[PDB]
């Protein structure tokens, strides 16, 4: 899953550039339009996931390198997460899952499959429990 192995022809480079442009423009514009509340939540997720990534670096890295070794579906990642969040109502596990899914996305070169994963897993992560924490902290 090395970026260079996906950028073999000029068409590959140009198509990457166009897809990046479209996605970057869209994300910048979305943020420009977001309510202050939503922006505050983004900042919290940023700061708290950075703490997980910092404080548990070696743990997170292990989880990444294990996901590398085996092949599995977005579906079953999702279902494995939903099971954990059912009986674990902690804040930490939700933050760690966001960091983990985010890393998985960084390692995925299929943009449609990536957004599908982010979209599904964001539904799973944002249960009543998570919403209560985020609104409490904010």
């Amino acid at each position: 899953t090395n970026i260079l192995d996906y950028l073999s022809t000029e068409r590959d480079h140009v198509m990457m550039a166009v897809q990046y442009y479209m996605s970057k423009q869209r994300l910048d514009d979305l943020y420009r339009q977001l309510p202050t509340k939503t922006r505050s939540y983004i900042d919290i997720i940023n700061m708290y996931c950075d703490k997980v990534n910092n404080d548990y670096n070696r743990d997170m890295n292990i989880m990444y390198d294990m996901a590398s070794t085996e092949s599995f579906t977005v579906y079953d990642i999702n279902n494995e997460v939903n099971t954990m969040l059912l009986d674990n109502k902690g804040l930490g596990v939700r933050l760690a899952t966001i960091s983990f899914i985010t890393e998985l996305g960084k390692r995925c070169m299929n943009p449609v499959e990536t957004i599908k994963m982010f979209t599904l897993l964001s539904h799973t992560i944002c249960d009543d429990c998570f919403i209560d924490y985020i609104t409490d902290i904010s």
Binding site: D59, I77, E80
Partner: peptide, 29 residues
């Protein structure tokens, strides 16, 4: 399978981060 192991790992990391926050500062923790 592996997926289960990772998910279990995520909960362990999460719970340890929760326990490192001084009690009371976050409702529900």
């Amino acid at each position: 399978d592996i997926i289960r192991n990772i998910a279990r790992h995520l909960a362990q990391v999460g719970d340890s981060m929760d326990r490192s926050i001084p009690p009371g500062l976050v409702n529900g923790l």
